[PDB]
């Protein structure tokens, strides 16, 4: 699970070496970031309901057929709408994990590995989620390092989907 601290140790262990100033600087880099990430995670968490419901609507608006067409993969009934809001919630929650962990680890572990297989198997369009992730980017109201780190994880997922 990629984070600065585990990557530092993973590299040193591969080399059979004690941690050196290089790894200590890695830790200092993490400490420089941690509070901004934690504050970003808090802000996303407290606004999570609004962001998720806003994102779902943004998808429905950009892709109207998803709420009009019948089929297990679409959100034309409350069942499909609940699935869609659930999924967007998953993306949001795991992004908050990345902010806490300081790395894409949680996204790699919990969401990204296998997402292609899911989307193909259940006939879900990656474009839908890309739209949802853009809305979250545009509406989380973060600033400074909180914004930059949050957007990088949101963009990481978008690039994984594209």
């Amino acid at each position: 699970m990629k984070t600065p601290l585990t990557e530092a140790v993973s590299t040193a262990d591969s080399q059979g070496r004690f941690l050196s100033s290089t790894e200590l600087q890695i830790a200092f880099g993490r400490l420089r970031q941690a509070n901004a990430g934690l504050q970003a995670a808090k802000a996303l968490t407290d606004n999570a309901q609004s962001l998720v419901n806003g994102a779902a609507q943004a998808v429905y608006n950009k892709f109207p057929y998803t709420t009009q067409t019948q089929g297990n993969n679409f959100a034309a009934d409350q069942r499909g709408k609940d699935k869609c809001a659930r999924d967007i919630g998953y993306y949001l929650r795991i992004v908050t994990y990345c902010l806490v962990a300081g790395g894409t680890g949680p996204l790699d572990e919990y969401l990204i590995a296998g997402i292609d297989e899911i989307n193909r198997t259940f006939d879900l369009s990656p474009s839908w989620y890309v739209e949802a992730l853009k809305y979250i980017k545009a509406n989380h109201g973060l600033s400074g390092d909180a914004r930059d780190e949050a957007n990088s994880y949101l963009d990481y997922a978008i690039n994984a989907l594209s």
Partner: protein, 172 residues
């Protein structure tokens, strides 16, 4: 492997929950200790050779059977392996201190180590004594008040002591 942050994340994903307010504030408190944690890792690392060699010298002085002819630490190859092992264990303890989680130590170092030693005939109780001596030396170095910004490192010291305790228990 887990670090202090991803350990908490793992337990949260298992329940499908955002980290709670108190959990986020706990991790902030961990961040506030970050410099102390780095210093402790740096002091142990800077003194690694002495920590190992002094501990080894004390071990063989207290347990001379190890180095008598026929003792497990007799012959250059066995003495070299023994000195290497103590350094390996100290190294992974610093890894665990650096990450703030025992997973690296438990997974990469202690897994199957008790079983390795019995299979080779290495006396694990004597390995554990060596770890103890390294622990004692390591904590004194970490607690050394000279040449460093003054503060309370009691919590980091306790954590480090815990990692040494795991190592000592695991080897036998």
């Amino acid at each position: 492997m887990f670090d202090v942050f991803t350990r908490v994340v793992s337990q949260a994903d298992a329940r499908g929950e955002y980290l709670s307010g108190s959990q986020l504030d706990a991790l902030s408190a961990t961040v506030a200790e970050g410099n102390k944690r780095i210093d402790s890792v740096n002091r142990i690392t800077g003194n690694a050779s002495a920590i190992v060699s002094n501990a080894a010298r004390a071990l063989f002085a207290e347990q001379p059977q190890l180095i008598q002819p026929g003792g497990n630490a007799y012959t250059s190859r066995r003495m070299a392996a023994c000195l290497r092992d103590m350094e390996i264990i100290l190294r992974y303890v610093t890894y665990a201190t650096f990450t703030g989680d025992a997973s690296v130590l438990e997974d990469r170092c202690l897994n199957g180590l008790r079983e390795t030693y019995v299979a080779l005939g290495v006396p694990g109780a004597s390995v554990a004594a060596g770890v103890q001596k390294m622990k004692e030396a390591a904590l004194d170095i970490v607690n050394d008040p000279n040449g460093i910004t003054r503060g309370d490192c009691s919590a980091i010291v306790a954590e480090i002591a815990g990692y040494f305790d795991r190592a000592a228990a695991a080897v036998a």
